[PDB]
Design a binder for this molecule. Structure first.
Ligand SMILES: NS(=O)(=O)c1ccc(C(=O)NCCC(=O)/N=C/Cc2cnc[nH]2)cc1
Ligand SMILES: [Cu+2]
Ligand SMILES: [Cu+2]
Ligand SMILES: [Cu+2]
Ligand SMILES: [Zn+2]
Length: 259
C-alpha cells in the first residue's frame, strides 16, 4: 500500500523521508553542463559486448518495465570506457514524461529529451547484483536519450509487447532481443559517479550517458503512457511520467569521451 512513485503524495520530493540517501553527496540524475565537461586521456572507448545476450522476459514492476537478461554468465558485458573490470548486463528499462517535451532523467545544458533508456550492469568482482549495488564501483548504467523524430523500428519490437504487461506484476516472455539495437551509431559519452535514480537510491553507479540520442516517434511515446502503476483490480493509475529530476552536482566532475 505504501511504496514510492511519481504521484502527488509518493513522489521524488518525498523520497528522502523514506530513503535519506536521497539527499546524499552523489545522487543521480544530473544536468550535464557541456561547457564544464573535462577531457581525461585515461578514458577508453566503451566495449559493449552484447552478441550473445539472452533476453528472458519483460516485466511491469509498477514503476517502469524491465527487459530482463540472463546474468548467470558473462553473456552480455560492458567493459572499458571509464570502468575497471567486467560488468554484466542484467536488465534495461526506460523513463519517460507526460508530454514529448520532457521525460529524460539526465539533461544536457538543461535540455530534456522525451525518454531515457537505462542499460543496467553489475561488477562481476562482487558475485551478484545485490552485493554490487552496495559498493561505489559496483554498478554501471548506460543511459541513452530518446529524441522525438522518426519512429524507431527496434523500439517498436519492445512497444508491441506492452499490451501484455499493462498492470503491475504482469510479465511476458521476451526472447531474442538484441539490446545493442537500441544504441546510437556513435558511442561518445559523458561519465560521472552517481546513484540509482529510484529507491533505494544507492551511490554505486558509474554513469555512462551517451551523447547521441536514438529516435522515437510521438506516436510511439503514447504507448509508454498506456502502462499502469497499479496492480489489476486496483484503481487505475496511468504510467504518465516516471522520471526523477536533476539533482545537485555537489562538485562532482563530469568527464567526456573522446572529449
Ligand atoms: N534507474 S536506474 O537505472 O538508476 C536503476 C537501476 C536499478 C534499480 C534497482 O533497484 N535494481 C533492481 C533490478 C532487478 O529487478 N533485478 C533483478 C535480478 C535479475 C535477474 N535477471 C534479471 N534481473 C533501480 C534504479
Ligand atoms: Cu513504489
Ligand atoms: Cu509506486
Ligand atoms: Cu513514503
Ligand atoms: Zn532508470
Amino acid at each position: 500500500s505504501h511504496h514510492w512513485g511519481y504521484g502527488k503524495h509518493n513522489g521524488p520530493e518525498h523520497w528522502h523521508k523514506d530513503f535519506p540517501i536521497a539527499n546524499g553527496e552523489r545522487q543521480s540524475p544530473v544536468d550535464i553542463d557541456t561547457k564544464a565537461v573535462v577531457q581525461d586521456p585515461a578514458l577508453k572507448p566503451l566495449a559493449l559486448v552484447y552478441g550473445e545476450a539472452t533476453s528472458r522476459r519483460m516485466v511491469n514492476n509498477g514503476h517502469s518495465f524491465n527487459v530482463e537478461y540472463d546474468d548467470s554468465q558473462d553473456k552480455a558485458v560492458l567493459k572499458d570506457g571509464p570502468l575497471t573490470g567486467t560488468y554484466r548486463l542484467v536488465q534495461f528499462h526506460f523513463h519517460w514524461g507526460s508530454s514529448d517535451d520532457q521525460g529524460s532523467e539526465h539533461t544536457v545544458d538543461r535540455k530534456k529529451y522525451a525518454a531515457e533508456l537505462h542499460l543496467v550492469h553489475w561488477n562481476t568482482k562482487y558475485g551478484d547484483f545485490g552485493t554490487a549495488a552496495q559498493q561505489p564501483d559496483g554498478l554501471a548504467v548506460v543511459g541513452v536519450f530518446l529524441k522525438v523524430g522518426d519512429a524507431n523500428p527496434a523500439l517498436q519490437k519492445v512497444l508491441d509487447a506492452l499490451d501484455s504487461i499493462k498492470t503491475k506484476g504482469k510479465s511476458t516472455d521476451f526472447p531474442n532481443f538484441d539490446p545493442g539495437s537500441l544504441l546510437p551509431n556513435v558511442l561518445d559519452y559523458w561519465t560521472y559517479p552517481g546513484s540509482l535514480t529510484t529507491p533505494p537510491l544507492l551511490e554505486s553507479v558509474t554513469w555512462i550517458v551517451l551523447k547521441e540520442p536514438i529516435s522515437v516517434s510521438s506516436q510511439q511515446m503514447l504507448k509508454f503512457r498506456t502502462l499502469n502503476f497499479n496492480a489489476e483490480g486496483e484503481p487505475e493509475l496511468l504510467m504518465l511520467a516516471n522520471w526523477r529530476p536533476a539533482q545537485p552536482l555537489k562538485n562532482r566532475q563530469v568527464r567526456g569521451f573522446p572529449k
